[PDB]
Design a protein around this nucleic acid. Structure first.
Lengths: 74, 82, 504, 79, 90, 90, 88, 84, 77
DNA sequence: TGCCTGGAGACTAGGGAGTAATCCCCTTGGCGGTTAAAACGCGGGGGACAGCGCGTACGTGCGTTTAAGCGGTGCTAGAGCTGTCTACGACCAATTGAGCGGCCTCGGCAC
DNA sequence: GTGCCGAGGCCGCTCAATTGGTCGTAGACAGCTCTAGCACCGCTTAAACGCACGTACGCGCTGTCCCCCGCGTTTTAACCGCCAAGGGGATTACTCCCTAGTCTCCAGGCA
């Protein structure tokens, strides 16, 4: 996993990026952490499949680029 | 009765999703909830027996859905906390 | 002398032939109605020969010097024959085939076509496909001042989109040329009356009353309003006393019962439970169609499931359906006498069945249908007409026979079944009954007793009675019984059509 | 300020390991940093929209789950 | 408000020999409630599409068939038909 | 139900000099109808979520924000604030 | 009547559609006003892009091809219309 | 002779070719063809199942365009221009 | 413009739908909608696999590329 | 295990559910025929693909620093709940005018 | 240069939008309690960093078979038009019984 309070400051930065004076609570921060973990690990699984299709053991960033482009969100 | 037909009708009225629901429809829908709970808990118990523990935990549930093809298809887009 | 003088003077340039008396009188009537500006319906004879009177009427217009564009619409199968006939009867008449694809469209519309009327303008022969497609591209670029159309029973209703293309006509001139004009009801007579005389047959409200003590007199009253004039007005002569050259012919209808396996299938089917029984052995909604199909032969339903592309042994076919096995003994009779036997049917799904039977029985395979192309169709016609060929079977689809195939050389014909259109049956038998036959063709129709197809046959007779009105104003046959019936009337299990002519 | 550096290289390493990745290239880190910032910013945008809908000045797990469901991410574990 | 007692009864009747944790209880309750929401919403939405004013067991039929994949839907429709017949008889 | 004449008049407002086709009106009417449906459904569901027996402009703004894309949504909220101020002035 | 807010959509018709949809037990007064506002912004935006496309290809008509090109070109409309499929 | 054609292969080899060409694919291989049969088939049953569900719900044993477009909406791909 | 032949497509849809469940009937509009949907899905998968192939440093597309795209989409039944 | 809150049994009054009646545009195994597409043959040239050398970038181990995390501590802004009363929104009758169907003209566009 | 055909503009006609009023009640608002997030500090230790180093693997090139692609040619199936008689959806209207609403008795689920 990732470290809870580092991810906490990251979410705080994201929030203050949009509009300020917003308060976060512990279960909300935890839920954000779980959701981010799930989405990122799924993306990595997809990129691993793309790379094994690419006949190379190494994953490069254009693998992730391809996975995102196929998934259809940018 | 197995699920609380009266209280589930209470929530369905709270939704007020139509003029009013069928007469036997609430019993039907309690029954279908019972059925779906039945298979999900049945396979949760199968996983627990595989691991031989006295309390079913989210890890067993996640294993159950991820391992049963049809249940995973139903729950493809969901993730389980922890 | 009077006939010769009239045919010469009234037709100054009918150079390539001659006109017989009564159709010549028809020509003078046509000329008079043109002088009256009224168009009429030609239905005279089952293609006795009509083109002759077409030139007879038209060449009078050229003889008077009344130049004007001519339009003809004809079926493809006979366009070349029609050109040969018009060339034969008058070499002095200019004519062209207007057929081919868009390329021949291009070459004709580049070279052969002047806008202005003139003697250099030839007769333009346009086929049906032209009539459906080229409406805008030609019918508006010509005020066709002469219009004649053949095989006029083509327009069976007001919705045949041939007619919707034709409403793009400058329809000043008309000549409906057809054979028998009645097609199963009143609708097609009404449609043809509107086409020929829309300004007269404007509305159907008055004549709608006659789809079906004082009513007996009203039958003449139906004739009295219109048909009392239509009978002189419709140029068509039924044979009362003119073509006694027509040879003797008779036809009989059988009424034997139907066997067991099919009655249990139809018991399942009438309750819509046939698929339930086949499911035990291992859902067609249009019930009347499946009733007909079962009447043909049970295989169709097996065949529905089957997979037995190659089908189980012949003796089974012998044992399932009674009509086919009675057909088996009657063909045993006919091959015993070595006649040339014609067979007709309605659906390929049974055509292939008795083709397989005939092949497995050791007989030659002679199969012609709409699925085979044209050149092998004539090669099979030549094989059948060959004297050295001993084949006595010609498996032909009834519907495909509308191309004018002449197979009169056969000596016998067997109409296995009859269609809902009676005149269709009449051309089906005409394929061999036309003038030129040498032997007494003898025709049997197989009808399934205690079946809805009996009712189909009875309403076919009802339509025959409608034909007659429009024109005018259960045993098993034993050897002794069959020999009695085919001596060279009324009976149990067999009926001969009573004389449709009401006295010589 | 520039807090995204908190997501460390061994973090991506172990998350890819959980993803079954055997061999990670060097430029993966920045791309991952990106994809996480975009994903999280869509999520936070939806969450702040819902909190505005709530008339309240804090962010709660309930409308967080609402947002994740709206993003085609359905989450079980918090109601 | 949850279905804690009813899930407890279900588990004791089907698999009496194994219990459930608090977190597992909560997550499967969320499972039940989410199916609750999706079924109610789908039934209401299809009723509205039918321009139909009220909902009954037949709309529940079509909604359940819609939202359940094949084998699960067949089992669910079987048990639901039995339940509705039992209610009609009673 | 038809908006066709209103598509016509909006075309006159924006660019009256430019034409439009029958299938074009069909697709525009489908666009208008289903965007209407999406906004209404999101607002209704969110009103169900917040246990509010009323739907009004405020929850419509939040529904618009949650469903529309970002830039077009800030444009929409600006123009709709102007419109609601105009309607309040009446 | 719409002049009270200066809008150009049928406040009455969208009101009747909210009512007949029965999307809620209670309807706010300005709710149709805001519905019409967002709808008119959407319509103006899409027709503006259609007109720009017509100007670009030197054509005086708008056709489903025009619509599809506009949707697939504009990033905002592409995002709003993800699973969009347009006939013809 | 009894005959029953393959039907499922009725999507002709040139049909796949210009499907791909409209899709911008330049160079294609052989088993693409059977794989595309499989893909079209599987994509078909999903929408067919949704459509038959709505036909059953509508008390009618005929399909209608409204039910079709609703089904396509349900599988999550909006089709426009048909009034749905 | 329609790209797959309409009468073959109607045989396809009729036969498959009959397989899935009995007593069904379609019309011209339903057939046309199904045709449009099939064309859309096929072109989408084709563009997806074209991008996959061009990523694969290769120009000839194969069913393993098709199956890769299928797997990322995830609608395997 | 206590209780108090909701859950369950009974009367009535409508109005949706089912049932009966009526019509018509849709369906079905065959045909002519007619095009443009589609199926089969073949040469080839481009590419798919196996193998090798590399050299360079990532995994591994270990010393070194670092801040995340645990345990308290104070504090306070904002959430959760409640009482009021007030404006705003549902219901209903009369009115019209602008939205919807039919009809016609006239300019863009392949030819 | 042109003609043709589908969209733009026209009027006639109707039912839902409008206005007003009434009245019932959901929200706007104030205010309280409290509590949970938030800033702060300190100690501790697993974890992250850097770096040397090896090695294995992405890659770029080379070299060889194979099989789509284009093109051509011959078949043929879609597409269309048409024939045959009936039935499942559409639509309308009647009727009747199911149950919402309500009240009253009592038991079971949470603390």
């Amino acid at each position: 996993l990732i470290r809870k309070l580092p991810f906490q400051r990251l979410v705080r930065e994201i929030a203050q990026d949009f509009k300020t004076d917003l308060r976060f609570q512990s279960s909300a921060v935890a839920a954000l952490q779980e959701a981010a973990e799930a989405y990122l690990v799924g993306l990595f699984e997809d990129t691993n499949l793309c790379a094994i299709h690419a006949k190379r053991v190494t994953i490069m960033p254009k693998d992730i680029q391809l996975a995102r482009r196929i998934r259809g969100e940018r | 009765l197995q699920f609380p037909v009266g209280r589930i009708t209470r929530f369905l009225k709270k939704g007020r999703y139509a003029q009013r629901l069928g007469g036997g429809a609430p019993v039907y829908m309690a029954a279908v909830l019972e059925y779906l709970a039945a298979e999900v808990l049945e396979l949760a118990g199968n996983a627990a027996r595989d691991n031989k523990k006295s309390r079913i935990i989210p890890r067993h549930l996640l294993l159950a859905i991820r391992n049963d093809e049809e249940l995973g298809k139903l729950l493809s887009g969901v993730t389980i906390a922890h | 002398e009077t006939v010769i003088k009239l045919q010469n003077e009234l037709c100054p340039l009918l150079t390539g032939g001659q006109l017989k008396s009564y159709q010549l009188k028809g020509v003078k009537w046509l000329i008079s109605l043109w002088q009256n500006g009224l168009n009429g319906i030609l239905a005279d004879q089952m293609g006795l020969g009509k083109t002759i009177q077409t030139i007879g009427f038209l060449s009078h217009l050229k003889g008077n010097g009344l130049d004007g564009p001519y339009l003809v619409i004809a079926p493809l199968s006979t366009l070349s024959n029609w050109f040969n006939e018009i060339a034969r009867f008058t070499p002095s008449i200019n004519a062209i085939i207007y057929h081919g694809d868009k390329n021949q469209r291009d070459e004709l519309r580049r070279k052969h076509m002047p806008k202005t009327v003139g003697p250099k303008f030839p007769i333009v022969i346009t086929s049906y496909e032209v009539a459906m497609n080229d409406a805008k591209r030609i019918l508006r670029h010509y005020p066709w001042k002469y219009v004649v159309i053949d095989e006029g029973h083509r327009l069976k209703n007001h919705k045949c989109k041939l007619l919707r293309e034709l409403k793009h006509l400058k329809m000043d001139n008309k000549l409906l040329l057809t054979g028998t004009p009645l097609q199963n009801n009143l609708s097609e007579l009404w449609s043809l009356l509107n086409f020929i005389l829309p300004d007269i047959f404007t509305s159907h409200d008055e004549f709608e009353s006659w789809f079906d003590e004082e009513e007996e007199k009203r039958r003449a009253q139906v004739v009295s309003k219109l048909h009392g004039i239509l009978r002189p007005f419709i140029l068509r002569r039924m044979k009362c006393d003119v073509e006694l050259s027509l040879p003797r012919k008779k036809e009989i209808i059988m009424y034997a019962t139907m066997t067991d396996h099919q009655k249990k299938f139809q018991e399942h089917l009438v309750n819509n439970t046939l698929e339930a029984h086949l499911g035990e052995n291992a859902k067609l909604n249009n019930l009347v169609i499946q009733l007909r199909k079962n009447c043909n032969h049970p295989d169709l339903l097996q065949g529905q499931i089957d997979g037995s592309y190659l089908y189980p042994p012949v003796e089974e076919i012998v044992g399932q359906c009674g009509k086919f096995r009675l057909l088996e003994r009657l063909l045993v009779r006919l091959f015993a006498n070595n006649h040339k036997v014609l067979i007709f049917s309605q659906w390929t799904k049974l055509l292939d069945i008795m083709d397989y039977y005939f092949s497995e029985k050791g007989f030659e395979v002679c199969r012609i249908d709409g699925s085979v192309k044209l050149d092998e169709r004539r090669r099979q016609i030549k094989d059948f007409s060959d004297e050295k060929s001993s084949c006595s079977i010609f498996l032909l689809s009834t519907r495909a026979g509308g191309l004018g195939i002449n197979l009169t050389a056969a000596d016998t014909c067997i109409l296995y079944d009859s269609d809902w259109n009676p005149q269709m049956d009449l051309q089906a038998m005409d394929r061999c009954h036309r003038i030129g036959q040498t032997k007494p063709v003898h025709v049997y129709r197989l009808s399934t007793a205690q079946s809805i197809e009996t009712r189909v046959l009875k309403r076919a007779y009802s339509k025959l009675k409608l034909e007659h009105v429009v024109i005018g104003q259960q045993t098993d046959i034993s050897d002794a019984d069959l020999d009695r019936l085919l001596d060279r009337v009324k009976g149990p299990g067999w009926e001969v059509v009573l004389p449709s002519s009401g006295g010589m | 300020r520039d807090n995204i550096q908190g997501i460390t290289k061994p973090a991506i390493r172990r998350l890819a390991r959980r993803g079954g990745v055997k061999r990670i290239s060097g430029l993966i880190y920045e791309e991952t940093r990106g994809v996480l910032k975009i994903f999280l910013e869509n999520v936070i945008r939806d969450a702040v929209t819902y909190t505005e809908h709530a008339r309240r000045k804090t962010v709660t797990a309930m409308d967080v789950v609402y947002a994740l469901k709206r993003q085609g991410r359905t989450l079980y574990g918090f109601g | 408000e949850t279905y804690k007692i009813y899930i407890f009864k279900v588990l004791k009747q089907v698999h009496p020999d194994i219990g459930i944790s608090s977190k597992a209880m909560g997550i499967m309750n969320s499972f039940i409630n989410d199916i609750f929401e999706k079924l109610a919403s789908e039934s209401s939405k299809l009723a509205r599409y039918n321009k139909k004013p009220t909902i009954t067991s037949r709309e529940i039929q079509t909604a359940v068939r819609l939202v359940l994949p094949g084998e699960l839907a067949k089992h669910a429709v079987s048990e639901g038909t039995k339940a509705v017949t039992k209610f009609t008889s009673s």
